[PDB]
Design a protein around this nucleic acid. Sequence first.
DNA 1: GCCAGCGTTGGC
DNA 2: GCCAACGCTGGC
Length: 71
Amino acid sequence: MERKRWECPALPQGWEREEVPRRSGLSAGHRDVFYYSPSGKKFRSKPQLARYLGGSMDLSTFDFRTGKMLM
DNA sequence: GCCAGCGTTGGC
DNA sequence: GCCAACGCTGGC
């Protein structure tokens, strides 16, 4: 349960994926997933992400939780 | 019963 | 006033 962040190969150049495990409360150990644009904007849901990227690329099979396209 | 999506807010 | 961190909940 450590924070990890680096490049997401399923998104365009400069986009990054991050996992932050929750450390307390009822949801402790749960891992939230975020994405960061090249400009550093923080995304925490697929609808949010799709408003920035959904025109420039196909996101219909992108799995926000895993960060990969569903084959 | 799980979890995507997002509401809430203590601590700053 | 912001926002990381966690809870809530509608849809499945």
